[PDB]
Short mmCIF file of C-alpha atoms in Angstrom, two decimals:
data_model
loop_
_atom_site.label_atom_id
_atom_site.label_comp_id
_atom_site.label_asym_id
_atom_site.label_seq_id
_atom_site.Cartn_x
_atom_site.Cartn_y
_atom_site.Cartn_z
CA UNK X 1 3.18 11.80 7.54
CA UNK X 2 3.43 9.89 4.13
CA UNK X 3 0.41 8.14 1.85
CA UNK X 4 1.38 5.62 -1.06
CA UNK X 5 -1.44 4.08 -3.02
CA UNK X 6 -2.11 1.47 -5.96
CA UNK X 7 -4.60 1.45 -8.40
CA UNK X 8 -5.78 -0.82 -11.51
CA UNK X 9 -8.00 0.39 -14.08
CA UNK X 10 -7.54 1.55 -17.49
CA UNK X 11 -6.49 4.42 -19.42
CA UNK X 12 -9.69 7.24 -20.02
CA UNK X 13 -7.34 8.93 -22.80
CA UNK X 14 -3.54 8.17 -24.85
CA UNK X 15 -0.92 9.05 -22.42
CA UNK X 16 -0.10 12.82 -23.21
CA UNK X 17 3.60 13.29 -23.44
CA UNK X 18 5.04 17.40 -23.08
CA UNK X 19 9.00 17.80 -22.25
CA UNK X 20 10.06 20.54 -19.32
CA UNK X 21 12.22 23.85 -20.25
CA UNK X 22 14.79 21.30 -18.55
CA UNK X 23 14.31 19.06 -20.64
CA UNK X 24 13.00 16.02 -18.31
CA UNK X 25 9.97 14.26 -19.71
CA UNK X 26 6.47 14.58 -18.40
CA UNK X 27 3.89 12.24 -19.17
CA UNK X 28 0.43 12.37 -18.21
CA UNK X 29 -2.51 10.60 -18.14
CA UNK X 30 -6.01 9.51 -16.30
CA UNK X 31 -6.98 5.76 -15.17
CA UNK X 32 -10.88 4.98 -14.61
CA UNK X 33 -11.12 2.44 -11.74
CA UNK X 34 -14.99 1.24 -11.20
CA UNK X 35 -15.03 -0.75 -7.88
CA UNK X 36 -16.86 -3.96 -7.21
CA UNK X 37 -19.32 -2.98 -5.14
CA UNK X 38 -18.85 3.29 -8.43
CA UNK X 39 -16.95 5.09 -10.90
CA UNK X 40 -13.66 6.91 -10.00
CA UNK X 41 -10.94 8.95 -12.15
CA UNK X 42 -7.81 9.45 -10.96
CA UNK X 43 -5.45 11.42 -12.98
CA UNK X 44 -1.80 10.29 -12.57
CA UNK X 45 1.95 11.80 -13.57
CA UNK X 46 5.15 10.10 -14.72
CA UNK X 47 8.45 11.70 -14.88
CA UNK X 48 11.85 10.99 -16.83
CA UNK X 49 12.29 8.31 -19.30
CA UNK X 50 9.19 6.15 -17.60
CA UNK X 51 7.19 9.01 -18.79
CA UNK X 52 8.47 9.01 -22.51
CA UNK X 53 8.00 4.73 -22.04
CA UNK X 54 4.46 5.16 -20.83
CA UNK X 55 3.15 7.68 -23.76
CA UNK X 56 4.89 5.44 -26.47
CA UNK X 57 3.41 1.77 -25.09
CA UNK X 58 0.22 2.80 -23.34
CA UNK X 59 -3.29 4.02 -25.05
CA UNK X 60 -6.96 4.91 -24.05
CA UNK X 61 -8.59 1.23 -22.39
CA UNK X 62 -5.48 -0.11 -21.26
CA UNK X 63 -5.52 -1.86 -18.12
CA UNK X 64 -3.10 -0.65 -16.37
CA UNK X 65 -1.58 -1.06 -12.44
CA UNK X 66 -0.21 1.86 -11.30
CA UNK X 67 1.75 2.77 -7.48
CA UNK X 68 2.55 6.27 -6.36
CA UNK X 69 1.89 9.33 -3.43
CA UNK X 70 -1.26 11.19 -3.55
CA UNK X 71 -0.84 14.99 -4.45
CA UNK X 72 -3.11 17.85 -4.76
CA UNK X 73 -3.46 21.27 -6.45
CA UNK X 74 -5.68 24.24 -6.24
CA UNK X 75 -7.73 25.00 -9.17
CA UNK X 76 -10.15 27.81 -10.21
CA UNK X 77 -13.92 26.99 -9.84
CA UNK X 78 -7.57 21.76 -5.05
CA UNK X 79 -7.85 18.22 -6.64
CA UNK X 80 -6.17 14.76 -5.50
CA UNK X 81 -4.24 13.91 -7.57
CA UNK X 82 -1.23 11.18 -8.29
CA UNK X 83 2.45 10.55 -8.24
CA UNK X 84 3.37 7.78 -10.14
CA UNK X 85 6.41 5.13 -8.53
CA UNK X 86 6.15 2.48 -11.39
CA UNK X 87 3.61 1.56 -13.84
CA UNK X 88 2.44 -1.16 -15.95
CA UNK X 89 0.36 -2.97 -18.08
CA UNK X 90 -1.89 -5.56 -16.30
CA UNK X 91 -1.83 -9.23 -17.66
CA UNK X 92 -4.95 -9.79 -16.36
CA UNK X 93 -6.79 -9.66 -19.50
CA UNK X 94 -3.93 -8.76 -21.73
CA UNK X 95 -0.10 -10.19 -22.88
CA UNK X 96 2.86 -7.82 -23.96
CA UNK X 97 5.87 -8.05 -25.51
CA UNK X 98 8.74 -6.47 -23.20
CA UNK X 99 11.93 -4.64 -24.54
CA UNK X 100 13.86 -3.78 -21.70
CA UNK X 101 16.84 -0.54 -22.29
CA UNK X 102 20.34 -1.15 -20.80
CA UNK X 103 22.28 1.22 -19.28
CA UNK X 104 21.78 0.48 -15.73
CA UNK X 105 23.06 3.45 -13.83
CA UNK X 106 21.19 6.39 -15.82
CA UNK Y 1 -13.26 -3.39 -12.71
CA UNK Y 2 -9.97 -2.19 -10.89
CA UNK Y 3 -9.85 -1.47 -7.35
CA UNK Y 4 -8.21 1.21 -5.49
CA UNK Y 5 -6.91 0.78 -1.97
CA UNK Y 6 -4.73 3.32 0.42
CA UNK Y 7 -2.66 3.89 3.50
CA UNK Y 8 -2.37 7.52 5.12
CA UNK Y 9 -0.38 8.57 8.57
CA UNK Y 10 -1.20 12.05 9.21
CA UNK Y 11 -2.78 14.56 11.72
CA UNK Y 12 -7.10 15.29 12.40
CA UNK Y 13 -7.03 19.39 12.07
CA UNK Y 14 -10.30 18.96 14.18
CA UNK Y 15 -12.56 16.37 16.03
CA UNK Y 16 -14.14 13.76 14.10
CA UNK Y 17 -17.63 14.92 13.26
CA UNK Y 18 -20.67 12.36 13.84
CA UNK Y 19 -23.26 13.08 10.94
CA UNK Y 20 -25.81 10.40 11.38
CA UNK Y 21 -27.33 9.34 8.27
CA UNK Y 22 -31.86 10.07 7.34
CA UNK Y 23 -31.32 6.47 7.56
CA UNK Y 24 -29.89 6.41 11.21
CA UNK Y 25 -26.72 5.27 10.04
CA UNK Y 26 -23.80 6.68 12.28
CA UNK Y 27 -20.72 8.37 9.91
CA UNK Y 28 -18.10 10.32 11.48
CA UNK Y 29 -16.58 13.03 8.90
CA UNK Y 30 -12.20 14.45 9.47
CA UNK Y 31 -9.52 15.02 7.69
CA UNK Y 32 -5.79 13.75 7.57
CA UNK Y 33 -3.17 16.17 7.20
CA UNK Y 34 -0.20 14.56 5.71
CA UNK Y 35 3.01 16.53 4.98
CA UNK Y 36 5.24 14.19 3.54
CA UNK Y 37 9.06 13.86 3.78
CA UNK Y 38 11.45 14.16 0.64
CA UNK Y 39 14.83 13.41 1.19
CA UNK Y 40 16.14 15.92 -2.09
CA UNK Y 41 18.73 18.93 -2.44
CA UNK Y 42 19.98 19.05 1.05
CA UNK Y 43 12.78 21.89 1.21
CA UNK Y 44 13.73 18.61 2.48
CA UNK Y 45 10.17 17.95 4.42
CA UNK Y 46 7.06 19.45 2.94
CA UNK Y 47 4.22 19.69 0.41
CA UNK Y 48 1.04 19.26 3.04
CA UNK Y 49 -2.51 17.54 1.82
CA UNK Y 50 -5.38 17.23 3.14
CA UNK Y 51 -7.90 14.08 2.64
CA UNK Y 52 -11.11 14.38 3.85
CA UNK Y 53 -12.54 10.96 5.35
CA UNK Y 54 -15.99 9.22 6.28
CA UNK Y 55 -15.92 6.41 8.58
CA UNK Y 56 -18.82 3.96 9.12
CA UNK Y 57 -20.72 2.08 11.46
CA UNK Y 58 -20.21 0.95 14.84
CA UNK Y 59 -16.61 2.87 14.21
CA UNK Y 60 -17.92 5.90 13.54
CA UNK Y 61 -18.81 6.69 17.03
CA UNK Y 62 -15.40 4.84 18.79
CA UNK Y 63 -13.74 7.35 16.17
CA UNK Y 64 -15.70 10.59 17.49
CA UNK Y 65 -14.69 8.97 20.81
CA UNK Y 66 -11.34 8.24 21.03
CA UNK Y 67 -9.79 10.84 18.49
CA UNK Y 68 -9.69 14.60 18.59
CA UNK Y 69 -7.70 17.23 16.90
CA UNK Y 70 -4.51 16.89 16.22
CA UNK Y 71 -3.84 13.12 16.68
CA UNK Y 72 -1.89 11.27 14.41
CA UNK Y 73 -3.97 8.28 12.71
CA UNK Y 74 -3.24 5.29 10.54
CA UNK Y 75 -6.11 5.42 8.01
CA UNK Y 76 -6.39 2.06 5.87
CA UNK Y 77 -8.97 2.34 2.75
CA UNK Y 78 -10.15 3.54 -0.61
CA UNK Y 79 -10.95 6.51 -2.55
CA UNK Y 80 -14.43 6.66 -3.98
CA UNK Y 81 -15.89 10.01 -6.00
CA UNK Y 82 -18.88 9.98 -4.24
CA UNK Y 83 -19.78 12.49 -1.89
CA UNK Y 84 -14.57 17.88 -6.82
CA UNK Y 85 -14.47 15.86 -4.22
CA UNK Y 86 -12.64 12.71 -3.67
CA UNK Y 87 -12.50 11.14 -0.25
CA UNK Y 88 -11.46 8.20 2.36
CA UNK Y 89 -13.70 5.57 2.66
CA UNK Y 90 -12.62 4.50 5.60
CA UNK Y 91 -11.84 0.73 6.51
CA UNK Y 92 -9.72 1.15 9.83
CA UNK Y 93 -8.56 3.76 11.81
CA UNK Y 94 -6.06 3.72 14.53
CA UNK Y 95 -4.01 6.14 16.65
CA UNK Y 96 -0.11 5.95 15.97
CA UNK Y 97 1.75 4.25 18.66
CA UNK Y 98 4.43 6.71 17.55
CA UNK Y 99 5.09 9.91 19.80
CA UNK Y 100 2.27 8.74 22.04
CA UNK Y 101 0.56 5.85 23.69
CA UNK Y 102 -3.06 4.66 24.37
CA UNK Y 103 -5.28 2.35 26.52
CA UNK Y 104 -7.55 -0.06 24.63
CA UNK Y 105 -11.22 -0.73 25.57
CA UNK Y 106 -13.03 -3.25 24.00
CA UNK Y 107 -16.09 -5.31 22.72
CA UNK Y 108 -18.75 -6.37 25.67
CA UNK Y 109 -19.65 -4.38 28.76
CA UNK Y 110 -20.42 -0.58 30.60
CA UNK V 1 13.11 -2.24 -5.79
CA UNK V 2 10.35 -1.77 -2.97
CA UNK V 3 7.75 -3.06 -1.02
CA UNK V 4 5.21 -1.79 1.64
CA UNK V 5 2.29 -3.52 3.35
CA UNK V 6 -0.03 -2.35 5.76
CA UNK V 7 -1.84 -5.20 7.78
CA UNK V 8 -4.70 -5.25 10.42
CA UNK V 9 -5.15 -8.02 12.72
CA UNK V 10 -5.04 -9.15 16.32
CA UNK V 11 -2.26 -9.65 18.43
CA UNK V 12 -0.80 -13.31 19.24
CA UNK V 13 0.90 -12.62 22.37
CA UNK V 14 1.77 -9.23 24.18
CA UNK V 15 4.84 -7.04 22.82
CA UNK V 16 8.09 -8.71 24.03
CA UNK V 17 10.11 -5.21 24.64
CA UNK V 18 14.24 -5.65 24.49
CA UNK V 19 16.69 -2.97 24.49
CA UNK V 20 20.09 -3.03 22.47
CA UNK V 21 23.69 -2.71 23.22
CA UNK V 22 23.59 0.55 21.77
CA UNK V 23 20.66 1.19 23.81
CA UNK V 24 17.99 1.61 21.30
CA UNK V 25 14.86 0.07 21.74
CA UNK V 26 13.51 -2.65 20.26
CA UNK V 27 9.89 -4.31 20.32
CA UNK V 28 8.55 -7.24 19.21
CA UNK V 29 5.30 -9.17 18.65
CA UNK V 30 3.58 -10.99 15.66
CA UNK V 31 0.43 -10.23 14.03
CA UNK V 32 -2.31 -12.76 13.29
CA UNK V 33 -4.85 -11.62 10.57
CA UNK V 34 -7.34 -14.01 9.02
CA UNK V 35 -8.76 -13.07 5.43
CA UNK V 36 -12.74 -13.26 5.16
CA UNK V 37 -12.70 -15.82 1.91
CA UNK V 38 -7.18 -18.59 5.83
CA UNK V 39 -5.06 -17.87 8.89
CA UNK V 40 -1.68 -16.19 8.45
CA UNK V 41 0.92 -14.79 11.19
CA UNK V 42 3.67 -12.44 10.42
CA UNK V 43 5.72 -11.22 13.18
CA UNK V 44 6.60 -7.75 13.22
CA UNK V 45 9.34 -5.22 15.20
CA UNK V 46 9.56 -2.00 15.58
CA UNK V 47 12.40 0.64 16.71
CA UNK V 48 13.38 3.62 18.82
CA UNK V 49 10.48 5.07 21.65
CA UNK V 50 7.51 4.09 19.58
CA UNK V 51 8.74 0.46 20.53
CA UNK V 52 8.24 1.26 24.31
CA UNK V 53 5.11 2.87 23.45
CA UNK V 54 4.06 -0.61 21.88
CA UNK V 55 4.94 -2.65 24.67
CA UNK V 56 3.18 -0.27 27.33
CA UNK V 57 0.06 0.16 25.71
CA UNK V 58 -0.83 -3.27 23.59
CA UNK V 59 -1.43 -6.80 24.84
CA UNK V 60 -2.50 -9.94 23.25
CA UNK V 61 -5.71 -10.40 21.48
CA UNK V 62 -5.75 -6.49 20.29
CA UNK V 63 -6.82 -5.41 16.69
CA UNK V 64 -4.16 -3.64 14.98
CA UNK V 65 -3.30 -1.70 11.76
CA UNK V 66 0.53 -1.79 10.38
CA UNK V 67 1.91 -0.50 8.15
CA UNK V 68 5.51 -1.15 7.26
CA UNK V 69 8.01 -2.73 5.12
CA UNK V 70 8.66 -6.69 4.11
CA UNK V 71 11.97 -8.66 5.46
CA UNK V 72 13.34 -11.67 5.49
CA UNK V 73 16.19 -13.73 7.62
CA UNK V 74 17.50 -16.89 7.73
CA UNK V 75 16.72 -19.68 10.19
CA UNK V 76 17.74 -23.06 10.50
CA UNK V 77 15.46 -26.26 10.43
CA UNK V 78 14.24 -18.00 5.36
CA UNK V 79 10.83 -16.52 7.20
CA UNK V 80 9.16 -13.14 5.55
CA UNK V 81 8.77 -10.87 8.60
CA UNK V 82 7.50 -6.78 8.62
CA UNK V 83 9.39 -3.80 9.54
CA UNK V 84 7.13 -1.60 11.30
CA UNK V 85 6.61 1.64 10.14
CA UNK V 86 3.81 2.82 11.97
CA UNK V 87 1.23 0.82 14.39
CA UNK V 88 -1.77 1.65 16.30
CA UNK V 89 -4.74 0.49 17.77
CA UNK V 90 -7.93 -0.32 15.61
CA UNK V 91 -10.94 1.54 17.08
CA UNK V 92 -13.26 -0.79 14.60
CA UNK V 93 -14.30 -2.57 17.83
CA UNK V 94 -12.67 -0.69 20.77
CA UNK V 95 -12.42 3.20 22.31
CA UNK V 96 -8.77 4.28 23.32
CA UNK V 97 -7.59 7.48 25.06
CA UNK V 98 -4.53 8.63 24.03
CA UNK V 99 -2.08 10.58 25.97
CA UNK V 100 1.02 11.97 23.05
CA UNK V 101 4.14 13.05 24.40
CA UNK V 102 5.55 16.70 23.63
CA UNK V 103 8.81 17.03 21.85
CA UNK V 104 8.48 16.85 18.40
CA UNK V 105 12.03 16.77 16.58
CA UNK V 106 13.17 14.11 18.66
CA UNK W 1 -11.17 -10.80 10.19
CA UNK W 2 -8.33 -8.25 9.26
CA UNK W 3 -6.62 -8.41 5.83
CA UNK W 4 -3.84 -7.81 4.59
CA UNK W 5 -2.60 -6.51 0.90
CA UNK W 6 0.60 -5.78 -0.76
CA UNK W 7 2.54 -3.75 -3.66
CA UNK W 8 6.22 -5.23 -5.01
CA UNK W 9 8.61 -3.74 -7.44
CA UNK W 10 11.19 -5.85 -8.45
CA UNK W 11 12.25 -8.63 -10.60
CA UNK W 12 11.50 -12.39 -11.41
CA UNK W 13 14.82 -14.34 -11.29
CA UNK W 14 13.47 -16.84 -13.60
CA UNK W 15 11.06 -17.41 -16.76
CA UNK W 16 7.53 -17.88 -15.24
CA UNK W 17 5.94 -21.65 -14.64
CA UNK W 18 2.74 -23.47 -15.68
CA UNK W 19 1.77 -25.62 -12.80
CA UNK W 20 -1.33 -27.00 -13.77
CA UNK W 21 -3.70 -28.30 -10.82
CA UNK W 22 -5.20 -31.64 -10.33
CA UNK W 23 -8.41 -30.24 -11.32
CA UNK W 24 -7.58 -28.51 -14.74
CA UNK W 25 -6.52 -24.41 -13.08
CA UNK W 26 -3.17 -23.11 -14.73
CA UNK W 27 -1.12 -21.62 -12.11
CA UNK W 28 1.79 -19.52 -13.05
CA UNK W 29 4.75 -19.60 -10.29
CA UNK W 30 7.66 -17.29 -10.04
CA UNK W 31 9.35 -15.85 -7.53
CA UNK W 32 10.02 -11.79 -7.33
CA UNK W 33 13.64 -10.04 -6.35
CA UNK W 34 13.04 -7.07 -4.81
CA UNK W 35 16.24 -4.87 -2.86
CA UNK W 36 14.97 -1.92 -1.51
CA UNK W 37 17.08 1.74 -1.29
CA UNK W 38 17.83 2.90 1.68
CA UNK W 39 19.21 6.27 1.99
CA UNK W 40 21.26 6.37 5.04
CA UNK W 41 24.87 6.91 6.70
CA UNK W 42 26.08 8.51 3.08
CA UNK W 43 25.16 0.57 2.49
CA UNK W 44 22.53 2.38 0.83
CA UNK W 45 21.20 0.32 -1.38
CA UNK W 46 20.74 -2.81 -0.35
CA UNK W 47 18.99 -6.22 1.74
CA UNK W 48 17.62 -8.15 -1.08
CA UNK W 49 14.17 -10.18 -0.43
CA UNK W 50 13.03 -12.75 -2.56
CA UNK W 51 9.11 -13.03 -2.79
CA UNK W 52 7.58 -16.41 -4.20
CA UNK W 53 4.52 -15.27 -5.70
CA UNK W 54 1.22 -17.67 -7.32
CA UNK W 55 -1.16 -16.23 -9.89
CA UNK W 56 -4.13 -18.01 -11.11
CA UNK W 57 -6.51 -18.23 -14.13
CA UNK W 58 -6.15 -16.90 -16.96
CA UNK W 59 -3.10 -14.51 -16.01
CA UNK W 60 -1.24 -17.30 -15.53
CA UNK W 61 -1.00 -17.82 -19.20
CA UNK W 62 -0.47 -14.50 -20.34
CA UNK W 63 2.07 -14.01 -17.43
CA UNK W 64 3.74 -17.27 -18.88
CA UNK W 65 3.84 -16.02 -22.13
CA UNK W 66 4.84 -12.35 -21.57
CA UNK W 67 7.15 -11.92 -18.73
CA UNK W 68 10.59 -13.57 -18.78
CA UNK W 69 13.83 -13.82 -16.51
CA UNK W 70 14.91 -10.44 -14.99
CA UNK W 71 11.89 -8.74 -15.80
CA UNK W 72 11.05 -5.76 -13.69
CA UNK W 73 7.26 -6.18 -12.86
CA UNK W 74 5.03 -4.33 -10.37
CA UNK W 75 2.15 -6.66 -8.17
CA UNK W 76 -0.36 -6.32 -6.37
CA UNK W 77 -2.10 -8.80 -4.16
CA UNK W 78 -1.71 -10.42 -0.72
CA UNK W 79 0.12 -12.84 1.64
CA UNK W 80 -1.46 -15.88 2.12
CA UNK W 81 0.31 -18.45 4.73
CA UNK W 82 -0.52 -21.74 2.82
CA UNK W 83 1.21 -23.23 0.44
CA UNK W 84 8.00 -21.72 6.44
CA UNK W 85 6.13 -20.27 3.31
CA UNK W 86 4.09 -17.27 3.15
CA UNK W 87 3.98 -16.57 -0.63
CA UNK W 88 2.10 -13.34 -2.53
CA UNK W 89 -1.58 -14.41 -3.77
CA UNK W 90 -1.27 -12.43 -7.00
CA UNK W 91 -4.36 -10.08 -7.85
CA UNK W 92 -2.40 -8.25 -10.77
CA UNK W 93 0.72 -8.14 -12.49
CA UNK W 94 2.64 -5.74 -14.80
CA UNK W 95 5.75 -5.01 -16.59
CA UNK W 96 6.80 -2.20 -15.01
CA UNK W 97 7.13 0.25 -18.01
CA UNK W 98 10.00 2.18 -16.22
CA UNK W 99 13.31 1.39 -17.87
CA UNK W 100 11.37 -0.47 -20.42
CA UNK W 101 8.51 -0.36 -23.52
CA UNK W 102 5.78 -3.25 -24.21
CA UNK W 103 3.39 -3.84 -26.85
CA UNK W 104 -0.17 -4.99 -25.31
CA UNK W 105 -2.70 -7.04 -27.17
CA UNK W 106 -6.28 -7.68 -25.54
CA UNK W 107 -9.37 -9.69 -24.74
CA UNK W 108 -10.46 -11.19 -28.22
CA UNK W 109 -8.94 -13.02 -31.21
CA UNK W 110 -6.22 -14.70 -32.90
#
């Protein structure tokens, strides 16, 4: 099948940036969403240059909106976790100051 | 503040399960097996998770029903912590019109 | 980019089924879902068997969920319409016995 | 009764706009670009969409002030059928931080 989800909420802790034997970037980070009619962390993960973007503009109580694919792993007493597609910082409450980076293709 | 709202296709691994509440509120309790595809290299279809979901309500017993293992569902809803453990709080539920077919009932009679 | 949408509503009229030249399949029908705090219609279509499988088993007036993708045409005096992903029948207010059909890769 | 809410990715074609109502609401318009990939045959990237999208209150301000022209944002919200014309009843918008950086302020000064 297939399962893509969105979420708003803000940042528990700074986005935690490690790099890959590779090389490719790994961000990593956990938004707190509390519903409206509680209380639910979802831990997300970000991969080349988005990740490196997200640890160096994002830090703990930013709003943020975040889309991605659920994903789980087993852990030692499995946990759902999430793929991030594209995220951002919510206007909502907040204003930014964008600087794009050209190169298109790569 | 922020919400949290989700869309899952995927299979039952077993018949709904109707766990009426002290209250006498009806829930039915399954969960969606969802193997997504990844069009990469050429594994080119896998990575399998489960979500466990609780359904509501009137729907809870249409669910325990109509469904049964195996069946391929459209689940619409959000993920609360309640209850490790985070699940499907169920808003609607249908069977996939894809690879099969269904009759309806409805709402007012037998 | 992207964009998906998943809508649940009740049907306007019953799926208008059509096949192509090529002799794919192709239904058709348009969803009307109105908001609780209105009225909207987007028409939807669908492709390959799981079009016939709309057609024989939904009529007008039924509660759906779809999921799919947005698209848009031109028309002369641009409409948003949905590419159907994946569609079934809500059981929020109805039963449904469902027969699948064996074959799986095809 | 059934909803109906939506994600986009893509970009806004144009610097936002202030539309203040009759009764004193701002009301930021814009409208966002979005052509999906498609990976088939080896076209596969293209069938661009444009998506007119309306966000109220406060955000409407801050999305005035922040986003620009060609910026790549991500939203969230739903398609209302006021107002041809369906357009995207913004809930929440972002700058999508992929292929870019932003500096965020807050709720509470200057």
């Amino acid at each position: 099948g297939d399962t893509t989800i969105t979420i708003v909420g803000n940042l528990t802790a700074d986005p935690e940036l490690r790099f890959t034997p590779s090389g490719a970037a790994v961000a990593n980070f956990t938004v707190a969403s509390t519903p409206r009619i509680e209380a639910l962390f979802l831990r997300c993960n970000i991969w080349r240059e988005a990740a490196e973007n997200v640890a160096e503009s994002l830090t703990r109580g930013a709003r943020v909106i975040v889309s991605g694919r659920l994903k789980q792993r087993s852990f030692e007493t499995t946990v759902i976790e999430v793929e991030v597609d594209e995220i951002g910082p919510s206007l909502r409450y907040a204003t930014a100051k964008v600087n794009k980076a050209s190169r298109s293709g790569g």
